[PDB]
Amino acid sequence: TGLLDGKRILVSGIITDSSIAFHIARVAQEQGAQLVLTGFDRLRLIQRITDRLPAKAPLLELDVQNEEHLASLAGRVTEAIGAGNKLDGVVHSIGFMPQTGMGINPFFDAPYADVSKGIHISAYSYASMAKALLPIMNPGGSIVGMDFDPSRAMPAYNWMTVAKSALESVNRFVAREAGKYGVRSNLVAAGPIRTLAMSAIVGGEAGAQIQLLEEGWDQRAPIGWNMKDATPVAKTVCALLSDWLPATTGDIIYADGGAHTQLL
Ligand SMILES: [C][C]S(=O)(=O)N1[N][C]C2=[C][C]=C(OC3=C(/[C]=N/[O])[C]=C(C(F)(F)F)[C]=[C]3)[C]=C2[B]1([O])[O]
């Protein structure tokens, strides 16, 4: 018997096999969840990444900036899940920020056009997705998004930090809307993870300062932190997807090795 036995969950944000969403999807399927996966612009290549998952899963096209995609998403999911069946979970693992708003680039030199695009994708889309999917969610359901603790400023992450701050605020309002359906809405604030996205930033002064953040994180974390292992994060997301945190919503769960509770 698995944690998510007989639950229908939509997982978005799977770009590579190193994406956090892939490990969330992997662990979810290991725990008995029936999945619906979304992607964009490389569905042939994405499906082949998806094929490495334990179980087969339908793949739907979703650009969270496309209003037509969002307006038809709910229906397209139903034609895949089956009529009379609803979703029990939605995982939002989508974030983006142009180079000008991250890395070694001066914080002031990021034009708003780039920042607005990042915030649309990283923060506003969380509400867009909730708006589209809540009608086809069962009571007791769970919406989960991804987060990186933005309560304090930091190097390199720059404007992505701001987009995460907005996301945290958006989540609290999504929770108000989700409550009417009996649905919870939460974020998982993870410690630093070596996704291909972040791995690129490290290589592409800033990269050294990222290493300083990574090193300091593991030391600070009372139980340690492995940036190469996304599994503890994925299990945390699955925990929120289950029925074992049923009184938690509009909230943030920190899967960071306990680093945010330690100063030094
Ligand atoms: C899920 C996709 S996402 O786009 O929306 N996203 N959300 C959560 C999230 C959580 C942790 C992350 O890892 C880091 C690292 C990693 N170092 O190895 C370094 C820094 C810093 F501050 F040093 F630059 C920040 C986050 C990345 C992401 B994220 O921005 O990819």
Numbering used by the authors: 5 to 208, 213 to 272
Text lifted from the article:
The frontline antitubercular drug isoniazid (INH) targets the mycobacterial enoyl-ACP reductase, InhA. Inhibition of InhA by INH–NAD results in impaired synthesis of mycolic acids. Here, we report the identification of the diazaborines as a new class of direct InhA inhibitors.
To further understand the inhibition mechanism of AN12855, a co-crystal structure of InhA-AN12855 was obtained in the absence of NAD+ to 2.65 Å. Unlike the initial oxaborole hits, this structure revealed a novel binding mode that involved no cofactor and no covalent bonding interaction. (i) AN12855 forms a binary complex with InhA and occupies both the cofactor and the substrate sites. (ii) The diazaborine head adopts the negatively charged tetrahedral form interacting with the catalytic residues Tyr158 and Lys165 through hydrogen bonds and charge–charge interactions. (iii) Similar to AN3438, the oxime group of AN12855 forms a hydrogen bond with Glu219 and stabilizes the salt bridge interactions between Arg195 and Glu219. The large increase in IC90 values observed with mutations at Arg195 and Glu219 are consistent with disruptions in the formation of hydrogen bonds between AN12855 and InhA. (iv) The CF3-substituted aryloxy group fully occupies the deep substrate site tightly packing with hydrophobic residues Tyr158, Ile215, Leu218, Ala157, Met119, and Phe149. Resistance to AN12855 in strains with InhAI215S is consistent with disruptions in this substrate-binding site. The Kd of AN12855 for InhA was 77 nM in both the presence and absence of NAD+. In conclusion, both the ITC and crystal structure of diazaborine AN12855 revealed a novel inhibition mechanism that is independent of the cofactor NAD+.
